[PDB]
Assembly symmetry: C3
Homo-oligomer: 237 residues x 3
């Protein structure tokens, strides 16, 4: 209806991306997606950004690519879900790392009800992120579930009262942003680089990623801060 | 004891396969397995079948291949488990997609207690379908668990009062059968084809499978039905 | 402070390894790690050992390699966790198969708080062992969780009152040790050998491992014992 189809805001080291078509339940638009991709590039390219939050306006969530298919942000992405996260909203959710929902949020992948296909990658990701039979139930029946059920399935990690999803997400982003950005981002890189590698092969990649972190200046600041019984002040190097 | 070792029945678009040796707790027989494999071929070859249900007779579950090892049905398979699903019964369970159990059902892989090995593929599948340490507990101790515990582990998705497992399974099959068969079956195909592929490689397979669905006639009927605010009438093309 | 940095004890077929630096919250030392690796070799080389338990002394857990990175014991390993299992303790935990914790135990991977990296392999293993978003929460925020929360996540399987973790672990080891060691160890071998192999390829490895078990003398003793309605007496051959 009014304004840009996605808003981008900054809060400390956290970049907040708000899908903003509330009159259309934040249904994806091409302008919404262009704003999202450039925010994604901002997250990757700005060393001052340590965390990203994805949310929707107007009591809905959503009902280089869109749902981050073929691309994943190099910094942590927290979903703050209020209200419906159906179809596109649940596919996007699987491209986020940490997941908070309001109590009244709903999840579901309804594409097959209309003989459509989930193009956002749910048929690849969902069985890898929650127990197989629970994933199959969602993908094949297309039924909608509550936030409580989603947490029970392991699809999200936190359920908060309605309206507090963004608040809790910002608490989590504040904890991430206070951690060493080089460590946080190396962990993500390892998770992605080692996917579907048997662990003896994966450990070789993971060990080299880790040793690189230990060679940083920030890896000296962390221990110094702990010995000086004070909070660390990381510089992304 | 009496009758064929497996019964096959039709209910709408759903084919129902009933392991039928209740005097022997539906222990697998070669005649039971031959009847199962030809029912499986019926599911795959009959475009009118959109869903399959596997259950057992007589208050037991079970206590191209048997437990669908080396072969998986190309259409969704729902387990309706009443009573014991031990050893063979829990291996078969892992070849099904959606899983309903009566409250008094029991699960377990007891082979190692007798220095036997689970030949139905549990040592491959189980750690991939539920959390690693829960899978290890089952496989290495051989202990039996309740339906409630199985749902807690993510091994099954639904627990219903005793005797209602098939009823709930038929509700779920009715929802699947009302969905677009080309979409439902492409999702399964993607899940199977992309297994253990890193997601950037998997997404290429998954995208092509999906686009093929969108090119179908049924993918036009689904949206037309929604716009005409009516239920869709799919033709498997 | 006093005594060897790790104790090794035997209870029937079970070898018990106790990280023993309680004054330092059982923080890993090089002497602790040397004692652990030789105990590991004992587990692998002694046919009389059928199960191993890893625990810590003094109401802490821990706060060929250390956390079994690059190496895994060929026999089942049960963690008995009392008190803090932070950082090193939670990485080690992921190299164990069956997991018991006292009610007051705590888990967490805090490395990133100090811009350090989890060198024990958590960035590879954790997302494979529990739901993706729960793993990401732990690894990226570094926050600590209770034993109840860990069981909810699927990170451990059993929560017992404080002080009873080793007792429950010994119950579980007794059940494992009574099972056929050739079967138990083949299951582990299959799990490890088939990791990240698509199941149709994995099943070929898993079938050959299993058939080898069935050719053993113990695979005849198990059925004979059941027919003689008596407990089996396995000889690891
Ligand atoms: Mg997995």
């Amino acid at each position: 209806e009014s304004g840009p189809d996605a808003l981008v805001e900054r809060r400390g080291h956290t970049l907040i991306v708000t899908m903003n078509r509330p009159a259309a339940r934040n249904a994806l638009s091409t302008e919404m997606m262009r704003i999202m991709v450039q925010a994604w590039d901002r997250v990757d390219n700005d060393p001052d950004i340590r965390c990203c939050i994805l949310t929707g306006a107007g009591g809905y969530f959503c009902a280089i690519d869109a749902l981050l298919k073929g691309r994943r942000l190099t910094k942590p992405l927290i979903a703050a879900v209020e209200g419906p996260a159906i179809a596109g909203g649940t596919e996007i959710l699987q491209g986020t790392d940490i997941r908070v929902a309001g109590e009244s949020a709903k999840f579901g992948i309804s594409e097959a009800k209309w003989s459509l296909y989930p193009m956002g990658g749910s048929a690849v990701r969902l069985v890898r992120q929650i127990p197989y039979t629970l994933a199959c139930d969602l993908l094949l029946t297309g039924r909608h579930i509550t936030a409580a059920e989603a947490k029970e399935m392991g699809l999200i990690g936190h359920v908060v009262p309605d309206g507090q999803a963004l608040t809790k997400a910002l608490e989590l982003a504040d904890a991430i942003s206070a951690n060493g950005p080089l460590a946080v981002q190396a962990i993500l890189r390892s998770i992605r680089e080692t996917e579907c590698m048997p662990e003896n092969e994966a450990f070789k990649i993971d060990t080299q990623i880790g040793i690189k972190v230990f060679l940083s200046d920030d890896a000296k600041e962390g221990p110094r801060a702990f010995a000086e019984k004070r909070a660390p002040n990381f510089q992304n190097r």
